Design a protein around this ligand. Structure first.
Ligand SMILES: NC(=O)c1ccc[n+]([C@@H]2O[C@H](COP(=O)([O-])OP(=O)(O)OC[C@H]3O[C@@H](n4cnc5c(N)ncnc54)[C@H](OP(=O)(O)O)[C@@H]3O)[C@@H](O)[C@H]2O)c1
Ligand SMILES: CC(C)Cc1ccc([C@H](C)C(=O)O)cc1
Length: 316
C-alpha cells in the first residue's frame, strides 16, 4: 500500500511522484538507472514527457521492474505530456501513440497538455524559421482538449489533465460547451518561494489536483532558469526546520506540499537522495511549522519558458 489521492475521474494518483527530466549534458542512460532506483525506493508515480527525450529509457525501466516481478503495472502511475508541436486535434492521438511506442507500454495513467502555447507541427520540438524566430501556431486548445478526451475514451490515457495553465486557461476548458472530462490536475511550479495559494484554492474549488514541479527549487538549468535566482534549499527557515526534525530542507519542502493537499514531484538521479525523498511519509509538520513555511512566499518563478512569451496563451 501507498498514499494516493482520488482524482475527479475516479482514478487514483500517488501523492509523491518521481521527476525524470535532466538537462541534455546528462546522458540518457542515467534515466534508466534512476527510474529503477525510484521504483525500488517506493515511488509509484513517475513523471515524464515526450519533450524530455527519455521515454525509451524510462519505459525500459518500468518494463524491467514489471518483468522481474518487482511491481505490477497497476502499481505504477505513469504520466506523459503532449508537446506543443502536437496541439492540432488530429495530431494528439498520434503523439500519444508515439510516446506509447517509445515506452513499449499499452497506456499512460495520465496525459497532460504540457504547455498552452502552440508551435508548428513536425519532428522539431522548438521549430524555428531561418531567422531564429519560433514558429508559433494558432490552435483552439478546446479542440486539443476534445482530442485528449477521445484518448481517454480509447483507453490510451486513464486520466487527462493540463500543465502550466493559469486561471483564464483553466476556465476556458471548464466552461467549454459539451465538456466531457474536466482536467484531473494542473501541473505547475510550486514551492515555498512561489506557493501558488491562489491558484491552489481555485483548483481545489473545482476538485482539480495541483501537482507541484520544481518543488525543490528546480534543476536550475541555463538558460531556462536565471542563475541569480535564490537557491530554495539554502533557505534558513527550511534549514532550521530540517535540523529540528533531523531531516533535510528538501524533505521539509516536500512535506509542506503533501500537507496542503498538493501532489509533489521530486527529481533526483542520486541513489541516496532518491531514497531520502520517500522519507516524506515518515514525519509531519505542525500548524505553526506550516505557517512558518507559508511565510516564505516571495513571488519567485524559476521557470518562465519566456521563449514562448508573446502569443495570447502564454500563461505567465
Ligand atoms: N510540466 C512542466 O512544465 C515541468 C517543468 C519542470 C519540471 N517538471 C517535472 O518536475 C520534475 C521535478 O522538477 P525539477 O526537475 O525542476 O527538479 P526538483 O525536483 O525541484 O529538483 C531537482 C534538483 O534537486 C536535487 N535534489 C533532489 N532531491 C534532493 C534532496 N533530497 N536533497 C537535495 N537536493 C535534492 C536534484 O539533484 P540530484 O538529481 O543530483 O539529486 C535536482 O538537481 C521534473 O523532473 C519533471 O518531471 C515539469
Ligand atoms: C529543453 C527544451 C528543448 C525541451 C523542454 C521544453 C519544455 C520543458 C518544460 C519547461 C519542462 O521542464 O517540463 C522541458 C524541456
Amino acid at each position: 500500500k501507498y498514499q494516493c489521492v482520488k482524482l475527479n475521474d475516479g482514478h487514483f494518483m500517488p501523492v509523491l511522484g518521481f521527476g525524470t527530466y535532466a538537462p541534455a549534458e546528462v546522458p540518457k542512460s542515467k534515466a534508466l538507472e534512476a527510474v529503477k532506483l525510484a521504483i525500488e525506493a517506493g515511488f509509484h508515480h513517475i513523471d515524464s514527457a515526450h519533450v524530455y527525450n527519455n521515454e525509451e529509457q524510462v519505459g525500459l525501466a518500468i518494463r524491467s521492474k514489471i518483468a522481474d516481478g518487482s511491481v505490477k503495472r497497476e502499481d505504477i502511475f505513469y504520466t506523459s505530456k503532449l508537446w506543443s508541436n502536437s496541439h492540432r486535434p488530429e495530431l494528439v492521438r498520434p503523439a500519444l501513440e508515439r510516446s506509447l511506442k517509445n515506452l513499449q507500454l499499452d497506456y499512460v495513467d495520465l496525459y497532460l497538455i504540457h504547455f498552452p502555447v502552440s508551435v508548428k507541427p513536425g519532428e522539431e520540438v522548438i521549430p524555428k524559421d531561418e531567422n531564429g524566430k519560433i514558429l508559433f501556431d494558432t490552435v483552439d486548445l478546446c479542440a486539443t482538449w476534445e482530442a485528449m478526451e477521445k484518448c481517454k475514451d480509447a483507453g490510451l490515457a486513464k486520466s487527462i489533465g493540463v500543465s502550466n495553465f493559469n486561471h483564464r486557461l483553466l476556465e476556458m476548458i471548464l466552461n467549454k460547451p459539451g465538456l466531457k472530462y474536466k482536467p484531473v490536475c494542473n501541473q505547475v511550479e510550486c514551492h515555498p518561494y512561489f506557493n501558488q495559494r491562489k491558484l491552489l484554492d481555485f483548483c481545489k474549488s473545482k476538485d482539480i489536483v495541483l501537482v507541484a514541479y520544481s518543488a525543490l527549487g528546480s534543476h536550475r538549468e541555463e538558460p531556462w532558469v536565471d542563475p541569480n535566482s535564490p537557491v530554495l534549499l539554502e533557505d534558513p527557515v527550511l534549514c532550521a526546520l530540517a535540523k529540528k526534525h533531523k531531516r533535510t530542507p528538501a524533505l521539509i519542502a516536500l512535506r509542506y506540499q503533501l500537507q496542503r493537499g498538493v501532489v509533489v514531484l521530486a527529481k533526483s538521479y542520486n541513489e541516496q537522495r532518491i531514497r531520502q525523498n520517500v522519507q516524506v511519509f515518515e514525519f509531519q509538520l505542525t500548524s505553526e511549522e506550516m505557517k512558518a513555511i507559508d511565510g516564505l512566499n516571495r513571488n519567485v518563478r524559476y521557470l518562465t519558458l519566456d521563449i514562448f512569451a508573446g502569443p495570447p496563451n502564454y500563461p505567465f
